[PDB]
Symmetry: D2
Subunit: 259 residues, 4 copies
Amino acid sequence: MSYGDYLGLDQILSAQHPLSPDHNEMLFIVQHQTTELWMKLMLHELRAARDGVKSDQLQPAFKMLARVSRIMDQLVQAWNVLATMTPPEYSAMRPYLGASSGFQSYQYREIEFILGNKNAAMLRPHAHRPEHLELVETALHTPSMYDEAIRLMARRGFQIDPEVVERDWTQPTQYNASVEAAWLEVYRNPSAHWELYELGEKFVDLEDAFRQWRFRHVTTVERVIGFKRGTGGTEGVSYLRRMLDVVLFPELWKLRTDL
Amino acid sequence: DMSYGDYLGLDQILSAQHPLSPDHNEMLFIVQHQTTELWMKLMLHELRAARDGVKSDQLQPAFKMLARVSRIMDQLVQAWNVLATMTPPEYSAMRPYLGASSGFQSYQYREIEFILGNKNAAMLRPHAHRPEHLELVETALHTPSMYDEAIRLMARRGFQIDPEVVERDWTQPTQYNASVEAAWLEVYRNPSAHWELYELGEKFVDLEDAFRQWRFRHVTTVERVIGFGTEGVSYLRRMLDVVLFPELWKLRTDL
Amino acid sequence: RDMSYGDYLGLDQILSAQHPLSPDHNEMLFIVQHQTTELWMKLMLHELRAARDGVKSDQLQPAFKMLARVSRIMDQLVQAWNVLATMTPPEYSAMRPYLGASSGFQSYQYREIEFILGNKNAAMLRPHAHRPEHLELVETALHTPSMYDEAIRLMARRGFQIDPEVVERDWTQPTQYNASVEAAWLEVYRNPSAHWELYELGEKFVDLEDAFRQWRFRHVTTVERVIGFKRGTGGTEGVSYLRRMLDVVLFPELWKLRTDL
Amino acid sequence: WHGAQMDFARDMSYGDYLGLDQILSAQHPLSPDHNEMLFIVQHQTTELWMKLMLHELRAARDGVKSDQLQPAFKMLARVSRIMDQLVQAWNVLATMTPPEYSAMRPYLGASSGFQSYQYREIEFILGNKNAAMLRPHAHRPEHLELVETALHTPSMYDEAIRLMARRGFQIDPEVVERDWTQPTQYNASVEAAWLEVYRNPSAHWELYELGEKFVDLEDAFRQWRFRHVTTVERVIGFKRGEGVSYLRRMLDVVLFPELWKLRTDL
Ligand code: HEM
Ligand code: HEM
Ligand code: HEM
Ligand code: HEM
């Protein structure tokens, strides 16, 4: 094998096709593609970590999660590159781009799903692509990594309501008081439940990082296209601002008030 | 209409990952290289336009592109943190399946080396079996580097530059030249009279520095995975002594 | 000069300024995290004041270099939160009883920073009334045209028709949107080659605001992960107060112009 | 303004609590140059972080020696975050150009970083013991005390070797107990033990994670050493002839040698 052959560089390096004649489009493309590639790896690591939670093998899953942390670090910092795109540069390419939409990233949606941000409406963008629909549908129906953590807590003897241990996995993650009581006992007695303590903090980290990514995205988008006002709640910067209110692991955050 | 994945070629880029081993960690090894190569693509794109801005004496937009190149280098130097999470056993399990493919074979990396003036004709060899890469690398070899172009722009601004450095065999390593340093010194000693050149000088130093860091992270991560003169970590260690823009660094002591 | 390392850097003071009040191991982090940030803020003020003087005596190229320095500083300040993020709620709970009413609300350097960036607020002088020396720095800072005010004035000196009422005004009032100022910026961004320094300058400002939003957002996220929606030692609503200050725009016309482009 | 306490005539404020009169009045430029503030602040912030780093390393080492590894891992995680700040910091000082430095140089005198006792305590805790490095601190008996206690105390790595021995690994006794003033050097029995650990990570997860935390620590420290020489070289250049050549030599420091060797023998 050559380097290029083993790495698939014939494909990786022939997928940059600028629609406009503008110098700054290569940036626009490469920034998305690098992100998509890292997401592929994040998905691979998260799914393995979830399998470790499932099988009570937390130590290797912690390692996987740490790797996800360092991947997320790349992704948040990446915005530093796109931030060198200016409004005039983007408006030069704009007319050539068409309706495309990060909304159509099926990898990003599977990440949200794996993190418990379930939404069956988010299947629609993928309906024309039965292979993508399948991936996102199956993830919608699979218990989230947080669902698995709650299940693990109950398999460690914490009295969690059965309706959050087994439920319709296609529904959004909603605060449950028995789950906060369990995390409270963990954080009040860390040396008695060190692994759950550590687990809790790795979830908070993952949420923290993802929040940062959400914020850096909407900030960068705004600095390139603005806050297009009065254009719907469904898309644009208005939508991306609402995405800042997403809570992934609710009782891990609430517990801080109640400690 | 054109979809997100149609525009971004996700069909290609997202099915180009082909692990040879059963090891869970091979995906990392692959995606690390791929994301880096992608970024190198954009870096090339940006450096070539910056070089054109130097040769046309339009430095303002060139500076903006170089600033962008720096942000990409920041990404590339930090990436190493992700690979750092591969432990030797992990890479040990993949290794039997890799075959003696090497980073020597990255033509994009070699073009970056060349545009930066680190010219070396022996380096075309790994690319002989692929006419498209061989062309790109050969052309780059014969093309004056961004440094060469900066030197020539100092000549056109009226600095006395040795004729033999304005026009030269361009397949030749970049080499210390005393008149070039004297021009750079005049620039640094009087920054307000030569602001653009002062700023450009510093962009070069930044770039070389950021490249040194990448050099160092690479060899250190390689060592922490497979452990410690022809080829190997020893080769990577010698790479640390590469000097790209000799007289900008020399000028520090003579200032 | 045969004065030593420590003597030159004042390490006797720097390195005996740590005074943990609780028995908790994690309090040194709480202290050093603030201290390092405050030190970097001093440097930042130092650079922003100079960069502002550059703007106002029309020496933009040095001021650009200085703002690039502020930007490298902001980058440290924003990544710094990764350190504090290693603090857990029980760790913080253990030192909280010993802390009293001290809170970053009473940072005077932070206020100077907001002021120089045009987020003027007279109410913000009171937490400093007990130290007449800080009072005076902050009060003078309130009264001084911001770096953004100086950019607007610069634009007027370059021939852009800016309303006199924003070329000269009561400087203690916070920044408010002005249509003539957006028109000025729009012309610059539509004709970048014809106005490159202004174009570069506008982007410096946006970078600055961007970095500052990041810092504010990392702050409030870190605070929530440590104390949730508990009220702040400073007496404020805590996280909800901090989320509100995320809402403030420093340089309105530079953001608004992106939609009108 | 939002229920915030305004009045601090009686109460302990932020500045009281943090000793900010101490911190914020310790900057005394000697040249009239704009850029000296940077030179000073850069060092001071690194010294501050270095203090916290000692605080956490000492506590981490305590957990190593009481076989309480979990808390130690968390401390070591924090030290890694601190080290990231310290490696990235060089981005700021990189903005200083030779002419800016040259202007303040005449005013500095013989202030060596050799004279940072905190930095020497970190080298020492990490096993880079060198008695000749107490010299710079002889004029300051409390600094000298700190540094020489450190020289005499077993390094964090020594304590890990020691813990492996308490955990049943055959370690040469002449490495479990040792002249702690002596530089750390390669012991085959120690590599043997790490090799057992890495070939069987699931049997020895805690040591496996510990080993990698040492390697992380050393790697980040290497990065700091590289960014240091590089930033120094771009400000004052490389005199061939202490010096930039001293700093180049430092790149050859190895702290945890059998953890690096074991990659080749795995
Ligand atoms: C200047 C460049 C960019 C612009 C103008 C932009 C704009 C937008 C907008 C307006 C949305 C809201 C949905 C919509 O209205 O279609 C969105 C969503 C999204 N974008 Fe970006 N974006 C940019 C860069 C990127 C990059 C580099 C990525 C990397 C993959 C990305 C990934 C996503 C994802 C994954 C979503 C869905 C988020 C959610 O549903 O919460 N975008 N983008
Ligand atoms: C643990 C994983 C890695 C190992 C073990 C490794 C090993 C090596 C070694 C030993 C060399 C020296 C030449 C040779 O003998 O083949 C080399 C060169 C090179 N590697 Fe890596 N490497 C790794 C990761 C990476 C990554 C992620 C990249 C990113 C693209 C990369 C890019 C390169 C390049 C561009 C060269 C040529 C450098 C030059 O000529 O100065 N390597 N690699
Ligand atoms: C995990 C530790 C921290 C906690 C729990 C925390 C909490 C808070 C809270 C609740 C406030 C609101 C005012 C109040 O009610 O007191 C505040 C304000 C503030 N804090 Fe923090 N903080 C932390 C770390 C830091 C650090 C490291 C800095 C660096 C200097 C900092 C700087 C500030 C500033 C400047 C304000 C006033 C901001 C404004 O009024 O817009 N904080 N902090
Ligand atoms: C442009 C600024 C700097 C210059 C020119 C510089 C130069 C040097 C040089 C030449 C040495 C070798 C010993 C000697 O000959 O005195 C040294 C050592 C040292 N410096 Fe730097 N330095 C700079 C910035 C810094 C900063 C910001 C720090 C942060 C604290 C630092 C920390 C140290 C330490 C701890 C040593 C001893 C290293 C060892 O023994 O391995 N230096 N410095």
